[PDB]
Design a binder for these strands. Structure first.
Ligand SMILES: CC[C@H]1OC(=O)[C@H](C)[C@@H](O[C@H]2C[C@@](C)(OC)[C@@H](O)[C@H](C)O2)[C@H](C)[C@@H](O[C@@H]2O[C@H](C)C[C@H](N(C)C)[C@H]2O)[C@](C)(O)C[C@@H](C)C(=O)[C@H](C)[C@@H](O)[C@]1(C)O
Ligand SMILES: [Mg+2]
Ligand SMILES: [Mg+2]
Ligand SMILES: [Mg+2]
Ligand SMILES: [Mg+2]
Ligand SMILES: [Mg+2]
Ligand SMILES: [Mg+2]
Ligand SMILES: [Mg+2]
Ligand SMILES: [Mg+2]
Ligand SMILES: [Mg+2]
Ligand SMILES: [Mg+2]
Ligand SMILES: [Mg+2]
Ligand SMILES: [Mg+2]
Ligand SMILES: [Mg+2]
Ligand SMILES: [Mg+2]
Ligand SMILES: [Mg+2]
Ligand SMILES: [Mg+2]
Ligand SMILES: [Mg+2]
Ligand SMILES: [Mg+2]
Ligand SMILES: [Mg+2]
Ligand SMILES: [Mg+2]
Ligand SMILES: [Mg+2]
Ligand SMILES: [Mg+2]
Ligand SMILES: [Mg+2]
Ligand SMILES: [Mg+2]
Ligand SMILES: [Mg+2]
Ligand SMILES: [Mg+2]
Ligand SMILES: [Mg+2]
Ligand SMILES: [Mg+2]
Ligand SMILES: [Mg+2]
Ligand SMILES: [Mg+2]
Ligand SMILES: [Mg+2]
Ligand SMILES: [Mg+2]
Ligand SMILES: [Mg+2]
Ligand SMILES: [Mg+2]
Ligand SMILES: [Mg+2]
Ligand SMILES: [Mg+2]
Ligand SMILES: [Mg+2]
Ligand SMILES: [Mg+2]
Ligand SMILES: [Mg+2]
Ligand SMILES: [Mg+2]
Ligand SMILES: [Mg+2]
Ligand SMILES: [Mg+2]
Ligand SMILES: [Mg+2]
Ligand SMILES: [Mg+2]
Ligand SMILES: [Mg+2]
Ligand SMILES: [Mg+2]
Ligand SMILES: [Mg+2]
Ligand SMILES: [Mg+2]
Ligand SMILES: [Mg+2]
Ligand SMILES: [Mg+2]
Ligand SMILES: [Mg+2]
Ligand SMILES: [Mg+2]
Ligand SMILES: [Mg+2]
Ligand SMILES: [Mg+2]
Ligand SMILES: [Mg+2]
Ligand SMILES: [Mg+2]
Ligand SMILES: [Mg+2]
Ligand SMILES: [Mg+2]
Ligand SMILES: [Mg+2]
Ligand SMILES: [Mg+2]
Ligand SMILES: [Mg+2]
Ligand SMILES: [Mg+2]
Ligand SMILES: [Mg+2]
Ligand SMILES: [Mg+2]
Ligand SMILES: [Mg+2]
Ligand SMILES: [Mg+2]
Ligand SMILES: [Mg+2]
Ligand SMILES: [Mg+2]
Ligand SMILES: [Mg+2]
Ligand SMILES: [Mg+2]
Ligand SMILES: [Mg+2]
Ligand SMILES: [Mg+2]
Ligand SMILES: [Mg+2]
Ligand SMILES: [Mg+2]
Ligand SMILES: [Mg+2]
Ligand SMILES: [Mg+2]
Ligand SMILES: [Mg+2]
Ligand SMILES: [Mg+2]
Ligand SMILES: [Mg+2]
Ligand SMILES: [Mg+2]
Ligand SMILES: [Mg+2]
Ligand SMILES: [Mg+2]
Ligand SMILES: [Mg+2]
Ligand SMILES: [Mg+2]
Ligand SMILES: [Mg+2]
Ligand SMILES: [Mg+2]
Ligand SMILES: [Mg+2]
Ligand SMILES: [Mg+2]
Ligand SMILES: [Mg+2]
Ligand SMILES: [Mg+2]
Ligand SMILES: [Mg+2]
Ligand SMILES: [Mg+2]
Ligand SMILES: [Mg+2]
Ligand SMILES: [Mg+2]
Ligand SMILES: [Mg+2]
Ligand SMILES: [Mg+2]
Ligand SMILES: [Mg+2]
Ligand SMILES: [Mg+2]
Ligand SMILES: [Mg+2]
Ligand SMILES: [Mg+2]
Ligand SMILES: [Mg+2]
Ligand SMILES: [Mg+2]
Ligand SMILES: [Mg+2]
Ligand SMILES: [Mg+2]
Ligand SMILES: [Mg+2]
Ligand SMILES: [Mg+2]
Ligand SMILES: [Mg+2]
Ligand SMILES: [Mg+2]
Ligand SMILES: [Mg+2]
Ligand SMILES: [Mg+2]
Ligand SMILES: [Mg+2]
Ligand SMILES: [Mg+2]
Ligand SMILES: [Mg+2]
Ligand SMILES: [Mg+2]
Ligand SMILES: [Mg+2]
Ligand SMILES: [Mg+2]
Ligand SMILES: [Mg+2]
Ligand SMILES: [Mg+2]
Ligand SMILES: [Mg+2]
Ligand SMILES: [Mg+2]
Ligand SMILES: [Mg+2]
Ligand SMILES: [Mg+2]
Ligand SMILES: [Mg+2]
Ligand SMILES: [Mg+2]
Ligand SMILES: [Mg+2]
Ligand SMILES: [Mg+2]
Ligand SMILES: [Mg+2]
Ligand SMILES: [Mg+2]
Ligand SMILES: [Mg+2]
Ligand SMILES: [Mg+2]
Ligand SMILES: [Mg+2]
Ligand SMILES: [Mg+2]
Ligand SMILES: [Mg+2]
Ligand SMILES: [Mg+2]
Ligand SMILES: [Mg+2]
Ligand SMILES: [Mg+2]
Ligand SMILES: [Mg+2]
Ligand SMILES: [Mg+2]
Ligand SMILES: [Mg+2]
Ligand SMILES: [Mg+2]
Ligand SMILES: [Mg+2]
Ligand SMILES: [Mg+2]
Ligand SMILES: [Mg+2]
Ligand SMILES: [Mg+2]
Ligand SMILES: [Mg+2]
Ligand SMILES: [Mg+2]
Ligand SMILES: [Mg+2]
Ligand SMILES: [Mg+2]
Ligand SMILES: [Mg+2]
Ligand SMILES: [Mg+2]
Ligand SMILES: [Mg+2]
Ligand SMILES: [Mg+2]
Ligand SMILES: [Mg+2]
Ligand SMILES: [Mg+2]
Ligand SMILES: [Mg+2]
Ligand SMILES: [Mg+2]
Ligand SMILES: [Mg+2]
Ligand SMILES: [Mg+2]
Ligand SMILES: [Mg+2]
Ligand SMILES: [Mg+2]
Ligand SMILES: [Mg+2]
Ligand SMILES: [Mg+2]
Ligand SMILES: [Mg+2]
Ligand SMILES: [Mg+2]
Ligand SMILES: [Mg+2]
Ligand SMILES: [Mg+2]
Ligand SMILES: [Mg+2]
Ligand SMILES: [Mg+2]
Ligand SMILES: [Mg+2]
Ligand SMILES: [Mg+2]
Ligand SMILES: [Mg+2]
Ligand SMILES: [Mg+2]
Ligand SMILES: [Mg+2]
Ligand SMILES: [Mg+2]
Ligand SMILES: [Mg+2]
Ligand SMILES: [Mg+2]
Ligand SMILES: [Mg+2]
Ligand SMILES: [Mg+2]
Ligand SMILES: [Mg+2]
Ligand SMILES: [Mg+2]
Ligand SMILES: [Mg+2]
Ligand SMILES: [Mg+2]
Ligand SMILES: [Mg+2]
Ligand SMILES: [Mg+2]
Ligand SMILES: [Mg+2]
Ligand SMILES: [Mg+2]
Ligand SMILES: [Mg+2]
Ligand SMILES: [Mg+2]
Ligand SMILES: [Mg+2]
Ligand SMILES: [Mg+2]
Ligand SMILES: [Mg+2]
Ligand SMILES: [Mg+2]
Ligand SMILES: [Mg+2]
Ligand SMILES: [Mg+2]
Ligand SMILES: [Mg+2]
Ligand SMILES: [Mg+2]
Ligand SMILES: [Mg+2]
Ligand SMILES: [Mg+2]
Ligand SMILES: [Mg+2]
Ligand SMILES: [Mg+2]
Ligand SMILES: [Mg+2]
Ligand SMILES: [Mg+2]
Ligand SMILES: [Mg+2]
Ligand SMILES: [Mg+2]
Ligand SMILES: [Mg+2]
Ligand SMILES: [Mg+2]
Ligand SMILES: [Mg+2]
Ligand SMILES: [Mg+2]
Ligand SMILES: [Mg+2]
Ligand SMILES: [Mg+2]
Ligand SMILES: [Mg+2]
Ligand SMILES: [Mg+2]
Ligand SMILES: [Mg+2]
Ligand SMILES: [Mg+2]
Ligand SMILES: [Mg+2]
Ligand SMILES: [Mg+2]
Ligand SMILES: [Mg+2]
Ligand SMILES: [Mg+2]
Ligand SMILES: [Mg+2]
Ligand SMILES: [Mg+2]
Ligand SMILES: [Mg+2]
Ligand SMILES: [Mg+2]
Ligand SMILES: [Mg+2]
Ligand SMILES: [Mg+2]
Ligand SMILES: [Mg+2]
Ligand SMILES: [Mg+2]
Ligand SMILES: [Mg+2]
Ligand SMILES: [Mg+2]
Ligand SMILES: [Mg+2]
Ligand SMILES: [Mg+2]
Ligand SMILES: [Mg+2]
Ligand SMILES: [Mg+2]
Ligand SMILES: [Mg+2]
Ligand SMILES: [Mg+2]
Ligand SMILES: [Mg+2]
Ligand SMILES: [Mg+2]
Ligand SMILES: [Mg+2]
Ligand SMILES: [Mg+2]
Ligand SMILES: [Mg+2]
Ligand SMILES: [Mg+2]
Ligand SMILES: [Mg+2]
Ligand SMILES: [Mg+2]
Ligand SMILES: [Mg+2]
Ligand SMILES: [Mg+2]
Ligand SMILES: [Mg+2]
Ligand SMILES: [Mg+2]
Ligand SMILES: [Mg+2]
Ligand SMILES: [Mg+2]
Ligand SMILES: [Mg+2]
Lengths: 275, 48
RNA sequence: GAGCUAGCCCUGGCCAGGGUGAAGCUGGGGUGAGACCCAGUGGAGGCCCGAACCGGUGGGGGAUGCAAACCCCUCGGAUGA
RNA sequence: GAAUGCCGGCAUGAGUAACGAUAAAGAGGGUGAGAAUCCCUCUCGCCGUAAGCCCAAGGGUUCCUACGCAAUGGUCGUCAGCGUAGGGUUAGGCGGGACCUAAGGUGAAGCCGAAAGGCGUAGCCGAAGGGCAGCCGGUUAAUAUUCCGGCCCUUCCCGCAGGUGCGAUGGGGGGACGCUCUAGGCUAGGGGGACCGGAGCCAUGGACGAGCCCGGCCAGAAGCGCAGGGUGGGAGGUAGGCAAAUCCGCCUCCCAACAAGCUCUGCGUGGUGGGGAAGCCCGGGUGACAACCCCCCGAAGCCAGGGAGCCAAGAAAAGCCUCUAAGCACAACCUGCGGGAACCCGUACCGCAAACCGACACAGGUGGGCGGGUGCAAGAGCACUCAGGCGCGCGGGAGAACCCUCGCCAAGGAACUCUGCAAGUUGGCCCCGUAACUUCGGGAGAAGGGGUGCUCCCUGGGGUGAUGAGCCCCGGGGAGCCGCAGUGAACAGGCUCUGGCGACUGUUUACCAAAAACACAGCUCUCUGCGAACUCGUAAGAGGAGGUAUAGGGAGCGACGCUUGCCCGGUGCCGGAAGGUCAAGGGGAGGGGUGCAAGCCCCGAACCGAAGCCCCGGUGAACGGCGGCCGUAACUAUAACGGUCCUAAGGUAGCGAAAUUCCUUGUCGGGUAAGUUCCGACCUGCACGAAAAGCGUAACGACCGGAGCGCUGUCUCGGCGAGGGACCCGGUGAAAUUGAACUGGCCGUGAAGAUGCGGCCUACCCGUGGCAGGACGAAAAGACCCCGUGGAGCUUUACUGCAGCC
RNA sequence: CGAUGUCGGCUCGUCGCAUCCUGGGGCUGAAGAAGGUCCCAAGGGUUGGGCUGUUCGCCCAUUAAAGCGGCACGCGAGCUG
RNA sequence: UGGGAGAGGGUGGUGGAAUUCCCGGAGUAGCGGUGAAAUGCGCAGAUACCGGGAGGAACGCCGAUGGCGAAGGCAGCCACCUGGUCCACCCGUGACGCUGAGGCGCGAAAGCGUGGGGAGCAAACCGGAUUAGAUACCCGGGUAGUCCACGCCCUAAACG
RNA sequence: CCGAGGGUAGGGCCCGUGACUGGGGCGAAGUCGUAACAAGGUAGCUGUACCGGAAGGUGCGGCUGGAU
């Protein structure tokens, strides 16, 4: 439920923020958090290997549980639901009757104080983790493992999901958030339901500084640079691209596919993406 | 205005000091050369 | 060689005073319930005025200078990128 | 003898410019060979959110004392941050270490790279972050939370007693956190007192007074008092916290619940130790048995880890508490008391500056805290002052031009000029009032005006206190007084109308451009299924991201509104197992060299044979492109209509002499007495146009235009005045430049612009203050231009190659 | 080319005369007045404005008239920019 | 009070045909399209045939001169939340009624905003053909839209 | 004190006029086409959307004031 403001500043005209109504706890679990190193897009060599990054809000990284087969058959209770700044999605705190506490990501409609579970015999119920094969065909599902027991990889960001089209042997046919049809092992754990906070994309950042809060440093076009800096640099006055539109490093950025065409996982990709 | 020299004893020793030279191959050859020329001091003096 | 300078990282510090009065909350009206209206409370904001601080618009001086970029008068930002 | 040669010495300009903020000086008395310059007093001026005081960087004896003045000091010097010598820095409690972690650094394991070396989990290092136990006064010429005095606390060792399952680098808790706003109650600090203590003082017309002047506190252990913080107690189950675990986490039950109890903080008091003014007198002595009280203001600091709300969601680790594991329970741990033990390093001095950074005793730069009073609405603003500190290391005169900084101005009022450039104007507070337009916020402090002091009387409400007084904070009414003037000084918008460009706040060419440029939220295209794409790297490894398509890279555009048309022939990209072209490799028809021969050796066609190209499509918010001629209407004119060649397709809406229009000051209209600019239109648009976006857009702008009002020294057109210079005198004393010079005008001549040649003319010798026409004046071996088979940056369907990718 | 600063403006002039005005003349298709044209004459004079960087030019209002040229398109060790 | 009909409205589900697209099988020289034809698609293996797969939309027969709503309008099928209405009985209140300026609400299509979605259809646009021309009628493509959610628009041959 | 009115500043409504621009009405015999009345030669009309020299064409839904 995105929030509008009255236009009492030039930048409050369109700026929108999340509702935070599904939030029930306003501080993290001191046991499930750890320091988060702001890299600033600079690798171990020190050099900027991802441009235009840095200077955002300090955050604490909450440990998220992407391998839910760790605790099979132990009913955890949905303790609270908390803001996580390292994600688009929200996170739910779970109190396993084991006594262990864990953060999962909150699917849609999941309510505080409900029992969730994981395992082959789990119910098909929002928030439960079964191997892919044991989920009935035709059910939206988030937090999918790609390869078995390597971690939940697909369908994680806000509002995303993944449908199961059918089965075919040791593999199921998943329709990814991007409309791709990939085959994923049936023994791959997944969580039933779409990720919550779907209203996330409607957020209008509203002003430049808000992007600066998020660690996004200003982007400078190539057409504004000099030939020493960019294919698009130079020109007297303005100038069209004057060549195939290109990145700073030379390769063409309009249409040029870059997926490796000998990659092994191609054997498991039925159909490249939609739209 | 703010000139370029802004002395900082910790900066001085950790950049041009003896132990910073002996670590790298170049800084060793710096020491060899100055020890060959006959310099009185091979490293910048700073009273710490 | 990043003790100048550009950015980023970690850890601290700094921003007189005054103005405007957002949502919300309360009460009243309203309605089938509402939207909503009004009032008070409230104290939002790359909000407004203006020191420190950060700047450097216009003019004058300076031009073997006080100074290898300075001085005076004006002027911009000043809870924020 | 010449290389704008090299090194050095000495000249010239020259007794010239200058002697470093215009805060400012004067006299007396000392000292001494010598005094504007040092010492002392008196008087005057300057800073006072500093030009004062206290930390930290950095500097490194510059600190104090004696003795000096060659040089350093822009003059002088007896003086000094200068020379010579002597002296000076005292810690269990301040800061750092023997404690902890942060980025980063390093790095057993492990990984990688010709070598060198590069990484890398732990671990280690790393601080202005965490943790941690001293406050006040006195003393030295110079150090003091360090020596001393008073009253306090910490650790380690050993011991006695009491108590307990003791026990850790292991498990747990805690440490532990953001921005904005903010409650209660304190203190820091300050204002007043008619209360208390005090050397005194009565002036010059009055006052011997509730007169004036001065001061009226600081530190403190246990206990107690006020104000807050922290925190439930019990038991049952227990599979989780990588062994265990009575702790922690989860579940049930019991009672406690806004409390209370306990624990810890701050503030108050407190045994006690201190401090203690002006004035007078020679830092000290007095004062003085000094007094040490009451009321008020009151923090941004304390209680503190308080409270609220918000989104962008806010270090770590140790100390400390708890749980237990080996081990051990003659030990070991907790508590209380006693005795003993307690190391290394810093401590002088400067510190918005004459000691730091600027080659200088350089108007510049330099992080943190304290920063007193009154008035002006507030305040760290502004003026004046306390404490404190200064008068800026050349002076004395004179009273020209001219320069700077400043004041005023008759009539005019932008006529100045590229331009109101500059300088006026306006100026804060309260009340009245306030337009088109708009995104309903705004535009807006729109505009325009009224008020403002001092005295008297009447009065409303608040804070404290107690409900009163008293101080204190907001006011309201009536009547008066004075001046030219009542924010009477200082600090403090000129306004309006209309265009262009960019939505906006923001960013930029450090040192000529702050803009219309960059950025920006927002729209689109494209890429990317995660060991992602992409980037850095030889690699390992990093980033991306401990992210997962509502996500990440790249690119164009640039809030918002209404919109973005036609062309796929070329170029890019994407799709296409056919076809054709194609490399090594396969095949080996068929020949060749040799040899007695077996054989060895070489050439070798058809055919099989990738990617890439060819070829078939697609595709524009991919690179891009979007015609010409001829004719036609019942007045002329112009062509809705036709005709034809060409195209891949012939510019759509909307705009338009425009940041674009050459002809151009286009033509018409407005504004003006007059308008190459400006605004509105027209349209044969040299040469607009739709995300290198098209047409609008409220708001915004130190952007660029036009106009008007107000007001002016901008001007007609200049005058006077002030101070700092120029000028004269004493002191100190540069510079660039310079072939040598005994260095006139005209008219000619000359390498074509002559002080230097010819002819004529003029002219006694040397200066000083001035002005700049010349010495093709100085400065920089022309930046333009050319030249060189000179250089470099950038580009591409130039050549060639390399990485990368296929 | 081991540098001769480049338009215009301002300031300050100075010279030429092929004279815009003032003075003197002849001819006139000169009645007067007022014009045309030529001759003599450089003594003095030769305005203030709107527009544009402009010189120039147009325009407003005057005027006796609103002259044309040279002086390195006179003059940046005189200013402006 | 007890009963009844119905595509009335809203929500949530779900079922079969059909077309398009993708995959396999089989198969070969044309399919398509019209007044005729050309475009277009097909030896790179189309069309016609079988199986599998995904997806959207719409509900054949019943079906009617039918039924409901105040109108716009409403049609597979099941369930839930819900309106209107009629009939029996003659039980209850006792004129409590009718109309309705303003007000408020509803209001087909198309269109607009933000999201999703997209099979068929199809303004715009492209091409073939017709034609003097053909910015058309015919044919082959084709974008918005048509669908969903929410939020506007509020017009109509909104008619009996 | 009030006060005619004078002055300054900003509003509101009306009238007249304005380069140019928008359609409108009219006008004996203009140019282009043929949309409509017959099934008007694509049944018409409609609200809307979009396009086009022009009448109009088409998508969507609606009406019969539509023919056999
Ligand atoms: C402040 C102090 C500086 O003076 C200036 O800036 C003036 C204002 C320059 O004009 C500036 C400004 C400007 C507009 O001059 C009017 C322009 O000409 C150029 C850009 O230089 C001068 C004089 C230039 O001379 C000019 O050289 C020109 C190439 C041609 C001309 N010559 C023919 C005579 C001559 O005057 C030139 C080169 O800078 C001189 C050289 C030696 C310098 O660099 C010297 C050291 C200067 O930096 C300076 C003296 O310190
Ligand atoms: Mg909003
Ligand atoms: Mg609003
Ligand atoms: Mg939420
Ligand atoms: Mg932790
Ligand atoms: Mg990271
Ligand atoms: Mg590293
Ligand atoms: Mg990058
Ligand atoms: Mg970056
Ligand atoms: Mg995310
Ligand atoms: Mg979240
Ligand atoms: Mg798999
Ligand atoms: Mg967005
Ligand atoms: Mg961004
Ligand atoms: Mg962030
Ligand atoms: Mg950009
Ligand atoms: Mg550029
Ligand atoms: Mg550029
Ligand atoms: Mg570079
Ligand atoms: Mg390049
Ligand atoms: Mg380019
Ligand atoms: Mg450019
Ligand atoms: Mg260009
Ligand atoms: Mg450019
Ligand atoms: Mg640009
Ligand atoms: Mg382009
Ligand atoms: Mg181009
Ligand atoms: Mg390219
Ligand atoms: Mg690449
Ligand atoms: Mg895909
Ligand atoms: Mg600097
Ligand atoms: Mg520094
Ligand atoms: Mg240091
Ligand atoms: Mg350092
Ligand atoms: Mg180093
Ligand atoms: Mg070192
Ligand atoms: Mg080596
Ligand atoms: Mg070695
Ligand atoms: Mg030696
Ligand atoms: Mg060295
Ligand atoms: Mg630096
Ligand atoms: Mg501030
Ligand atoms: Mg402020
Ligand atoms: Mg105010
Ligand atoms: Mg609230
Ligand atoms: Mg505020
Ligand atoms: Mg301001
Ligand atoms: Mg300046
Ligand atoms: Mg600066
Ligand atoms: Mg200079
Ligand atoms: Mg200055
Ligand atoms: Mg100033
Ligand atoms: Mg300022
Ligand atoms: Mg010689
Ligand atoms: Mg030489
Ligand atoms: Mg030499
Ligand atoms: Mg020499
Ligand atoms: Mg000499
Ligand atoms: Mg000599
Ligand atoms: Mg001399
Ligand atoms: Mg001289
Ligand atoms: Mg000088
Ligand atoms: Mg001086
Ligand atoms: Mg000064
Ligand atoms: Mg003296
Ligand atoms: Mg002397
Ligand atoms: Mg003295
Ligand atoms: Mg003060
Ligand atoms: Mg030094
Ligand atoms: Mg001396
Ligand atoms: Mg001397
Ligand atoms: Mg002497
Ligand atoms: Mg001596
Ligand atoms: Mg000096
Ligand atoms: Mg002496
Ligand atoms: Mg030791
Ligand atoms: Mg450590
Ligand atoms: Mg290393
Ligand atoms: Mg280190
Ligand atoms: Mg520390
Ligand atoms: Mg300590
Ligand atoms: Mg002390
Ligand atoms: Mg103490
Ligand atoms: Mg004992
Ligand atoms: Mg115990
Ligand atoms: Mg124990
Ligand atoms: Mg422990
Ligand atoms: Mg934390
Ligand atoms: Mg901290
Ligand atoms: Mg915040
Ligand atoms: Mg408080
Ligand atoms: Mg105290
Ligand atoms: Mg006070
Ligand atoms: Mg006494
Ligand atoms: Mg007397
Ligand atoms: Mg257990
Ligand atoms: Mg005594
Ligand atoms: Mg503070
Ligand atoms: Mg605190
Ligand atoms: Mg750590
Ligand atoms: Mg024993
Ligand atoms: Mg030791
Ligand atoms: Mg010691
Ligand atoms: Mg000391
Ligand atoms: Mg200063
Ligand atoms: Mg300071
Ligand atoms: Mg000093
Ligand atoms: Mg210097
Ligand atoms: Mg230096
Ligand atoms: Mg000095
Ligand atoms: Mg200084
Ligand atoms: Mg004081
Ligand atoms: Mg006083
Ligand atoms: Mg004030
Ligand atoms: Mg003093
Ligand atoms: Mg004189
Ligand atoms: Mg004299
Ligand atoms: Mg001054
Ligand atoms: Mg005055
Ligand atoms: Mg005047
Ligand atoms: Mg006037
Ligand atoms: Mg003017
Ligand atoms: Mg003038
Ligand atoms: Mg200008
Ligand atoms: Mg003024
Ligand atoms: Mg108006
Ligand atoms: Mg208004
Ligand atoms: Mg206006
Ligand atoms: Mg407007
Ligand atoms: Mg409004
Ligand atoms: Mg204001
Ligand atoms: Mg106002
Ligand atoms: Mg006003
Ligand atoms: Mg009054
Ligand atoms: Mg008075
Ligand atoms: Mg003022
Ligand atoms: Mg102001
Ligand atoms: Mg214009
Ligand atoms: Mg710009
Ligand atoms: Mg801007
Ligand atoms: Mg714009
Ligand atoms: Mg805009
Ligand atoms: Mg700002
Ligand atoms: Mg820039
Ligand atoms: Mg610059
Ligand atoms: Mg520059
Ligand atoms: Mg520079
Ligand atoms: Mg430079
Ligand atoms: Mg400048
Ligand atoms: Mg610029
Ligand atoms: Mg600016
Ligand atoms: Mg922008
Ligand atoms: Mg947009
Ligand atoms: Mg998009
Ligand atoms: Mg990571
Ligand atoms: Mg991106
Ligand atoms: Mg924009
Ligand atoms: Mg609009
Ligand atoms: Mg093309
Ligand atoms: Mg093509
Ligand atoms: Mg193409
Ligand atoms: Mg074939
Ligand atoms: Mg091939
Ligand atoms: Mg386009
Ligand atoms: Mg092109
Ligand atoms: Mg082309
Ligand atoms: Mg005819
Ligand atoms: Mg269009
Ligand atoms: Mg035009
Ligand atoms: Mg014009
Ligand atoms: Mg235009
Ligand atoms: Mg043009
Ligand atoms: Mg023109
Ligand atoms: Mg004209
Ligand atoms: Mg006119
Ligand atoms: Mg115009
Ligand atoms: Mg024309
Ligand atoms: Mg253009
Ligand atoms: Mg374009
Ligand atoms: Mg363009
Ligand atoms: Mg605009
Ligand atoms: Mg700006
Ligand atoms: Mg600006
Ligand atoms: Mg102007
Ligand atoms: Mg004006
Ligand atoms: Mg004016
Ligand atoms: Mg003057
Ligand atoms: Mg004077
Ligand atoms: Mg004399
Ligand atoms: Mg002398
Ligand atoms: Mg001297
Ligand atoms: Mg001679
Ligand atoms: Mg002579
Ligand atoms: Mg000649
Ligand atoms: Mg000559
Ligand atoms: Mg001569
Ligand atoms: Mg001769
Ligand atoms: Mg001669
Ligand atoms: Mg002279
Ligand atoms: Mg001269
Ligand atoms: Mg001159
Ligand atoms: Mg000269
Ligand atoms: Mg010369
Ligand atoms: Mg000269
Ligand atoms: Mg010269
Ligand atoms: Mg020279
Ligand atoms: Mg040169
Ligand atoms: Mg040279
Ligand atoms: Mg040369
Ligand atoms: Mg040349
Ligand atoms: Mg050469
Ligand atoms: Mg050559
Ligand atoms: Mg050549
Ligand atoms: Mg060359
Ligand atoms: Mg080169
Ligand atoms: Mg190579
Ligand atoms: Mg030359
Ligand atoms: Mg020379
Ligand atoms: Mg005459
Ligand atoms: Mg006559
Ligand atoms: Mg006559
Ligand atoms: Mg004659
Ligand atoms: Mg004359
Ligand atoms: Mg004139
Ligand atoms: Mg002119
Ligand atoms: Mg002209
Ligand atoms: Mg006359
Ligand atoms: Mg002339
Ligand atoms: Mg000449
Ligand atoms: Mg000249
Ligand atoms: Mg000339
Ligand atoms: Mg010329
Ligand atoms: Mg000239
Ligand atoms: Mg000049
Ligand atoms: Mg000039
Ligand atoms: Mg000149
Ligand atoms: Mg074929
Ligand atoms: Mg589909
Ligand atoms: Mg009855
Ligand atoms: Mg009714
Ligand atoms: Mg519809
Ligand atoms: Mg066609
Ligand atoms: Mg035909
Ligand atoms: Mg079709
Ligand atoms: Mg409707
Ligand atoms: Mg009908
Ligand atoms: Mg009158
Ligand atoms: Mg017809
Ligand atoms: Mg027909
Ligand atoms: Mg059509």
């Amino acid at each position: 439920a995105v929030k509008k403001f009255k236009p009492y500043t030039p930048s409050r005209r369109f700026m929108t923020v999340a509702d935070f109504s599904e939030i029930t706890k306003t501080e993290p679990e001191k046991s499930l958090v750890k320091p988060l190193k702001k890299t600033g897009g600079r690798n171990n060599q020190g050099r900027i290997t991802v441009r235009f990054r840095g200077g955002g809000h300090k955050r604490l990284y909450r440990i998220i549980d992407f391998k839910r087969w760790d605790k099979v058959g132990i009913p955890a209770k949905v303790a609270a639901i908390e803001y996580d700044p390292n994600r688009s999605a929200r996170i739910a705190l779970l109190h396993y009757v084991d006594g262990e506490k864990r953060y999962i990501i909150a699917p849609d409609g999941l309510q505080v104080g409900q029992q969730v579970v994981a395992g082959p015999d789990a119910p098909i119920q929002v928030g439960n983790a079964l191997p892919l094969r044991f989920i009935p065909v035709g059910t939206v599902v988030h937090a999918v493992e790609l390869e078995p027991k390597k971690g939940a990889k697909l369908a994680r960001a806000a509002g995303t999901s993944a449908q199961i089209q059918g089965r075919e042997g040791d593999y199921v046919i998943l329709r990814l958030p991007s409309g791709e049809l990939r085959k994923v092992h049936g023994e791959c754990y997944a969580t039933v339901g779409a990720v919550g906070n779907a209203d996330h994309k409607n957020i209008v950042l509203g002003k430049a500084g808000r992007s600066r809060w998020l660690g996004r440093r200003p982007h400078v076009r190539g057409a504004a640079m000099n030939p020493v800096d960019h294919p698009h640099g130079g020109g007297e006055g303005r100038a069209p691209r004057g060549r195939p539109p290109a990145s700073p490093w030379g390769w063409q950025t309009k249409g040029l596919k870059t997926r490796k065409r000998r990659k092994p996982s191609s054997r498991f990709i039925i159909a490249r993406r939609k739209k | 205005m703010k000139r370029t020299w802004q002395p900082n004893r910790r900066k001085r020793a950790k950049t041009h000091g003896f132990r910073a030279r002996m670590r790298t191959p170049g800084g060793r050859k710096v020491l060899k050369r100055r020890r060959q020329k006959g310099r009185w001091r091979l490293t910048p003096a700073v009273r710490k």
